[PDB]
């Protein structure tokens, strides 16, 4: 699964 801390700038639930 993706690591959400790889790029903190990325909100994975935003388009």
């Amino acid at each position: 699964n993706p690591d959400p801390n790889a790029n903190p700038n990325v909100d994975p639930n935003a388009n």
Partner: antibody, heavy 121, light 114 residues
Framework: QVQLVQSGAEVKKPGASVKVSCKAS????????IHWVRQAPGQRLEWMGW????????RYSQKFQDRVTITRDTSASTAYMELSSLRSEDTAVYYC??????????????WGQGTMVTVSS | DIVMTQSPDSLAVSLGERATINCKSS????????????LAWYQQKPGQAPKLLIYWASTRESGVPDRFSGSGSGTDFTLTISSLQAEDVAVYYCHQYYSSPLTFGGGTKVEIKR
């Protein structure tokens, strides 16, 4: 307009260290993470690490964790990357960047103009 | 590391023609739970920093022309320029943000022929 403005090009001797700065403007400094990416001549982009501007938390590529320190000064709205024990393979353009800022509201990606560091006697 | 491999390393087509760039990841970067591919495409012109064109593999950033299109899922991705404008002469890079370290492909140099 968000802007990232970096320090000027430098030459440094092998074995010495270099500290590049990255002044941010146009947004709330503490809200995002600044990344450092380098590009050796003729070669691909290489991610070095990020720093969260608000808490100062850091994450480093394994390739660089032994020799790189990323720091920030919220009062100056500036991030810094220090690379120690310089070697000829470190000659490169070093960028700071707000990489892939994907927010519920907006999406933006902003880079500094780059700083060429030459490792030479 | 998720290694990003681009193909071809260089291509040349005419103004108006279609340019295709392939990127393959060493690992699946699709998350089934949100159906998102953690991939971006960048454009880099000589002496400048890279410019974001596509994110989530297929989403164009605002301001990016509709002739740039991203496609693909899992480990196989494609950037297409439908009608090349001579300014599109640049190096194109894939990028994954699925896991650390963040990584980039080797780049695809796009040149023009008459």
């Amino acid at each position: 307009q968000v802007q990232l403005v970096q320090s000027g090009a430098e030459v440094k001797k092998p074995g010495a260290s270099v500290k590049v700065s990255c002044k941010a403007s146009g947004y709330t400094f503490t809200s995002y993470a600044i990344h450092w990416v380098r590009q050796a001549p003729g070669q691909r982009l290489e991610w070095m690490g990020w720093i969260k501007a608000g808490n100062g938390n850091t994450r480093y590529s394994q390739k660089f964790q032994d020799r790189v320190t990323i720091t920030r000064d919220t009062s100056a709205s500036t991030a810094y990357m220090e690379l120690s024990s310089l070697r000829s393979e470190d000659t490169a353009v070093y960028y700071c960047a707000l990489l892939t800022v994907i927010t519920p509201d907006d999406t933006f990606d902003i880079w500094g103009q780059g700083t060429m560091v030459t490792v030479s006697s | 590391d998720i290694v990003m491999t681009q193909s071809p390393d260089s291509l040349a087509v005419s103004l108006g023609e279609r340019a295709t760039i392939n990127c393959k990841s060493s690992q699946n970067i699709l998350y089934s739970s949100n159906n998102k591919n953690y991939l971006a495409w960048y454009q880099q012109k000589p002496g400048q920093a890279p410019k974001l064109l596509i994110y989530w593999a297929s989403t164009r950033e605002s301001g990016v022309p509709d002739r740039f299109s991203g496609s693909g899922s899992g480990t196989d991705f494609t950037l297409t320029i439908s009608s090349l404008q001579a300014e599109d002469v640049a190096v194109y890079y894939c990028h994954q943000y699925y896991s650390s370290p963040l990584t980039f492909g080797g780049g695809t140099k796009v040149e023009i022929k008459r």
